[PDB]
Design a protein around this ligand. Structure first.
Ligand SMILES: [O-][Cl+3]([O-])([O-])[O-]
Ligand SMILES: [O-][Cl+3]([O-])([O-])[O-]
Ligand SMILES: [O-][Cl+3]([O-])([O-])[O-]
Ligand SMILES: [O-]
Ligand SMILES: [Zn+2]
Length: 258
């Protein structure tokens, strides 16, 4: 695999190795707020993170992943548009070189500085690798980041980045509480889509929170000091690791809120 975010290997190129890039259920999308329908039949999201076990943080050359023990229902997402129980596997972010870009979803064409993806897989499939092959395999909680006041519960993340600067580096990351990444409100939009990274598999129920979290400018500047490259290689700052909005096609975005 040789994909990335650069002009030579970025999203406009992905379709050659991953033809599903041009499919019917691709993510991210622009969320047109006047067209999204309130669906009174959507439940409240159930985010049950009390028993989450974070383990490790890894620079994978595209983003950094905070990984969880998904060998048991500890940290699970249920309810909302979902049937069944979905285990948290990892979260990661997408961000820009500057605060005007970075999110993958957009809201009435507005871009946020960053977007957090909490990735969960459906336990009916047993493992992540099986879940990505199924149309209801993943549930991804997306959360926008704007820049303003610092998010206190992000700082433990930002503080360790210095130690995973380059691709393949990992560090212990136990006893991180992901509840500290959530806004107050769980109001959400939902639609059927895909992973936003190759292999771009069409296996995701998207749940995108309406309320952004605020992070400081120092927090997000520290994200932009990471590297896409390996140790000792030509430094390529890990910035603009976002896929742009894709066609909505034959899809309905639903709102949980009037
Ligand atoms: O040089 Cl391109 O990235 O247009 O193929
Ligand atoms: O003290 Cl920290 O913000 O690194 O957890
Ligand atoms: O964050 Cl994704 O898992 O939907 O690629
Ligand atoms: O992603
Ligand atoms: Zn993502």
């Amino acid at each position: 695999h040789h994909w990335g975010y650069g002009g030579h290997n970025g999203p406009e190129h992905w379709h050659k190795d991953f033809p599903i890039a041009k499919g019917e259920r691709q993510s991210p999308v622009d969320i047109d707020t006047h067209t999204a329908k309130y669906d009174p039949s959507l439940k409240p999201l159930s985010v049950s993170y009390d028993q989450a076990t974070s383990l490790r943080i890894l620079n994978n050359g595209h983003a950094f992943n905070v990984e969880f023990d998904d060998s048991q229902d500890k940290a699970v997402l249920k309810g909302g548009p979902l049937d069944g129980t979905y285990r948290l596997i990892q979260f990661h972010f997408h961000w820009g070189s500057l605060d005007g870009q970075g999110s993958e979803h957009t809201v009435d064409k507005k871009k946020y500085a960053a977007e957090l993806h909490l990735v969960h897989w459906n336990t009916k499939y047993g493992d992540f690798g099986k879940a990505v092959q199924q149309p209801d395999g993943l549930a991804v909680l997306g959360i926008f980041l704007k820049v303003g006041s610092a998010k206190p519960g992000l700082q433990k993340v930002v503080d360790v980045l210095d130690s995973i600067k380059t691709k393949g580096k990992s560090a212990d990351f136990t006893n991180f509480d992901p509840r500290g990444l959530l806004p107050e409100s769980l109001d959400y939009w939902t639609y059927p889509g895909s992973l936003t990274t190759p292999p771009l598999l069409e296996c995701v129920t998207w749940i995108v929170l309406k309320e952004p979290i605020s992070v400081s400018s120092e927090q997000v500047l520290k994200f932009r000091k990471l590297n896409f490259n390996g140790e000792g290689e030509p430094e390529e700052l890990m910035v603009d690791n976002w896929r742009p909005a894709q066609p909505l096609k034959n899809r309905q975005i639903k709102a949980s809120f009037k």
